[PDB]
Every structure is written in structure tokens, then in C-alpha cells.
Amino acid sequence: GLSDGEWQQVLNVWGKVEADIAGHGQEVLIRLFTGHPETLEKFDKFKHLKTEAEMKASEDLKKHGTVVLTALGGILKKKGHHEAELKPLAQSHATKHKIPIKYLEFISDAIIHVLHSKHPGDFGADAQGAMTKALELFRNDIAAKYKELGFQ
Ligand code: HEM
């Protein structure tokens, strides 16, 4: 897992996200949808968005971005002791939303990209390393739940 120092880095970086959750959430989803169009198809409520301009102007997309990052933030603050918070998320995304683990890899990468884009020069090598480890832990624990369900 992560060391105490690494978790402190993760939560310090997260402070940046919390200053503008909607903005970060919106950019993460737009990065995901524009870089991997197949992901948009998983959202019946966002498949009407044919352009990035429409995505940017969508208040409902910003709303979902807030829901997504608020959930992730709650998980991150548990510093790995997130079974109760993560299990239900893993099961809903596998059985209900049908989200391949590959898409979770895509959104993890999108988060790192957005952090650099919104905070250039202020997301250090150590910070990136820590956030990456936290996102991999998140993804890997979801993957374990996916295997349990036999979900691909
Ligand atoms: C940072 C990783 C993610 C987090 C924390 C997250 C969190 C959530 C939460 C809290 C909800 C609402 C509750 C629920 O249905 O469980 C939700 C809904 C949903 N998520 Fe995710 N999600 C993540 C990644 C993804 C990815 C990668 C996809 C597909 C590309 C996806 C697709 C969906 C869909 C389709 C819904 C239902 C939306 C609706 O129509 O209301 N999620 N997600």
C-alpha cells in the first residue's frame, strides 16, 4: 500500500481538487469522453453530447463530475481502509453500468492529466507518484471485486 508520507501527499493534492470540485470533475469526464468516445456510450444521459462544446456547456455533466469526485475523495480519505465505500461502487459499475476495468484505467489517467493541466508546475514528481499509487490501489481493489463477479 501507501506509506503515511505518501497518503499525506495524496490528500494534499486532493486539497486542490476540493477548491473546485465541479471544475475538476467536469474536466476529468471531458478528458475521458474525448479521448475514449466509447466511454460516452456507457452514459445514456450523456450520449447526446456530440461535441466538446456541448460537453463544456452541460450543467448535468458538471453535476455528475461532482458526484464522481466526491465519491473518490471520500474513498481517498480512508487511506486504503475503504472496503465499505469501494465494494458498492465496484458492484454498481460492474453489474449495473457494465464498466470494463479498462475504463477505470482511462479515468485514472485522466485525473493525472487534469491535475497537471490545471496546476502546471504545481504537481510535483513526488505528488504524481503518490496520487498514482492511490489511484492504482483504488483500481486494483475494484478489479478484485470484478473478478469475484466474473465481470469483464
Ligand atoms: C473515479 C472512478 C469513478 C467513480 C468514483 C465513480 C462514481 C460513481 C457514482 C458515485 C455514481 C452514482 C452512484 C452509482 O450508480 O453507483 C456513478 C454512476 C455512474 N458511473 Fe461512475 N464512477 C467512476 C468511473 C466511471 C467510469 C470510468 C464509467 C464509464 C466510462 C462510469 C460510468 C457510470 C455510469 C454510466 C453511471 C450511472 C449514471 C447515471 O445515469 O446516473 N463511472 N459513478
Side-chain angles (χ1 to χ4, degrees), residues 32-33 39 42-45 64 67-69 71-72 75 88-89 92-93 96-97 99 103-104 107 111 138:
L32 178 71
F33 297 155
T39 62
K42 290 292 180 174
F43 294 85
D44 294 305
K45 69 182 182 185
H64 191 65
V67 168
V68 172
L69 294 192
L72 180 55
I75 288 173
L89 192 64
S92 76
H93 283 64
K96 190 177 183 305
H97 311 316
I99 309 312
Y103 293 7
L104 289 172
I107 203 173
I111 288 170
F138 168 72

Side-chain angles (χ1 to χ4, degrees), residues 52 81 129 136:
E52 189 179 318
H81 301 80
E136 290 176 319

Side-chain angles (χ1 to χ4, degrees), residues 6 9-10 13 16 112 115-116 119-133:
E6 295 176 319
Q9 286 245 63
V10 173
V13 170
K16 293 179 171 53
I112 293 299
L115 286 169
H116 276 298
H119 311 282
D122 190 42
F123 183 36
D126 60 334
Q128 183 177 328
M131 185 56 78
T132 295
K133 283 187 66 173

Side-chain angles (χ1 to χ4, degrees), residues 16-60:
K16 293 179 171 53
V17 175
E18 303 189 312
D20 179 21
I21 297 186
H24 285 78
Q26 171 182 287
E27 284 187 47
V28 168
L29 293 177
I30 290 178
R31 177 68 181 187
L32 178 71
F33 297 155
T34 59
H36 309 280
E38 68 268 38
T39 62
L40 185 67
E41 298 308 305
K42 290 292 180 174
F43 294 85
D44 294 305
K45 69 182 182 185
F46 294 135
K47 52 175 55 183
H48 68 284
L49 296 171
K50 291 296 185 301
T51 66
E52 189 179 318
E54 297 180 304
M55 291 179 197
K56 286 287 189 63
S58 174
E59 293 308 313
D60 193 61

